[model samples]
Target: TSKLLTLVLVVQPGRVLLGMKKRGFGAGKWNGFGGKVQTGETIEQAARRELLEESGLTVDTLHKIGNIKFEFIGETELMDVHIFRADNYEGEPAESDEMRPQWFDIDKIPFSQMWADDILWFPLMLQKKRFLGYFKFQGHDVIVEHKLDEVEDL
Candidate 1:
């Protein structure tokens, strides 16, 4: 069974924003808009649901970039990550209990406030490139030691 899933999303700049769950926020440290893939729900469907649930913003389209797997403390799981660039969307970005929606300038993103791994691959994704990386976390400390594959285009 898949233990967890994640989505990386970005919207246009200058939108209203909120505080994302910070480090040490185990219960909700995740900043992206996503959740566990439900039964019978395709990866894309799950992505859409998670986006709406976490940010109250409806996703009109979602594109899969790549995926990775991880094992920890005798427990193993597959992480199906979908990278998306939402240049066009309806409604507005707002804060919710599951997420504190926030906006960052494309040129001036808040890397310090985001997950340690985000800064590593976000650039590639924004460039419409493909990226695969591994992030090791001993508690809240992020120690990246591996990257299997990376590509710019097909």
Candidate 2:
């Protein structure tokens, strides 16, 4: 079975905001804010909700930039993530129980400390280009095989 999730990046002039997951799935890694989609929420709404829950920010518009599917060699579940970029959001980012928010200069995004898959698609996402991708991982630390492509729409 597949689970729907949202991942959003808050971008502004020459900088982007990221959250350091304080616990659970992605602890210690800096990434966009997001979570699993709830039964009553639209995907976009879920994205916005997670953005607020994790960083205390609100965004009216989300640029749908990508769709990515992930599989783990030993896990039966699949993850279908809708990728987004947010602009003109409201409020200052505040750390919550789930995440510690930080802003990074565009040139200084901490890719080394982010998910390994990030470096593959971040440049495209930063350019506001839509895309699609699929990754199969041997474990959390290694990509067994993957497919990524730029597209006119995702």
Candidate 3:
């Protein structure tokens, strides 16, 4: 079984915004801002809330870009993560209790400090192509197997 989650990335002409998680789940890793969808709240709502809570930015627009299934070897609950991209937002990106925000040049994205699966789908997202993927993780940093592809529809 899988639990629904959301991840939102903010992109500009030459840079992308990411956050270094301070604690919990993907702690110590740099990632887009998001978390599990709350009951009665839409996925977009959860994405918006998490972005604000983690980065102190309010998204003005969000476009769905991908879906990823994160399967951990010993966990029954897989993470069904939906990815979104934001081109426009309000407020300066500020560090929050959960994340330290930073912007990186598109040509210099720090994949080494991110989840292994990020390197695979990130390019597709950068190219503005929709995509999908399934990653099997032996442990947090170890990806045992995976599948990824460009897609036309969600």
Candidate 4:
């Protein structure tokens, strides 16, 4: 069993928009723009809504880029994260109370300061590849095991 979460990445020609969470789980780490799915909200709706709430950007027709599930050792909560990518979007990124927005050149993603699994999949995301992954974490800072694969579809 897992809690559903959404993550949206605004990928442009040579850069991607990312955020540093300001508080709560995963706070202080650079990440995509998204959060928990609310009741009765279709995954896409939640993705878009969360993006707007966290980053103040409007995105249209996001692509289902991937799915990543995370399990932390000694914790009961499991994270079922649906990852989406927006090739076309509108507006400048404005920071919200939840996140601080920034753009990074494709060649310079700062994975060392992001979630442990981000480094493994972000490159695939930049390439527009679809994937599914599972990461088991020993702590917030370390992954004990993981399985990831590029797939034809999400």
Best by lDDT: 3
Query: Lowest summed lDDT over 10 consecutive residues: which window, candidate 4?
Result: 145-154
Clashes of 1: 1
lDDT of each: 0.60, 0.92, 0.93, 0.90
Instruction: Provide TM-scores for the models.
Output: 0.76, 0.95, 0.95, 0.95
Count of backbone collisions in candidate 3:
0
Model 2 lDDT-worst window of ten = 145-154
- List CA RMSD, all candidates: 3.5, 1.4, 1.4, 1.5
Task: Check candidate 3 and list the clashing pairs.
Answer: none
lDDT of 2 by residue, 88-140 (tens): 89899999999999999999999988988898899899898889999998888
Q: Write the per-residue lDDT of candidate 4 for residues 1-154, one digit (tens) a residue.
A: 7999999999889998999999998898999988888888888999998999889898879999899899999999899999999998888899899999999998899898899898888888888889999899998889899888898743
Model 3, 119-144: lDDT tens digits are: 98998898889998999999889999
Better of 1 and 4 by TM-score: 4
Candidate 1: misplaced stretches above 4 Å? 13-19, 22-30, 71-80, 151-154
Higher-lDDT candidate among 2 and 4?
2
Judged by whole-model lDDT over C-alpha atoms, candidate 2 comes out at 0.92
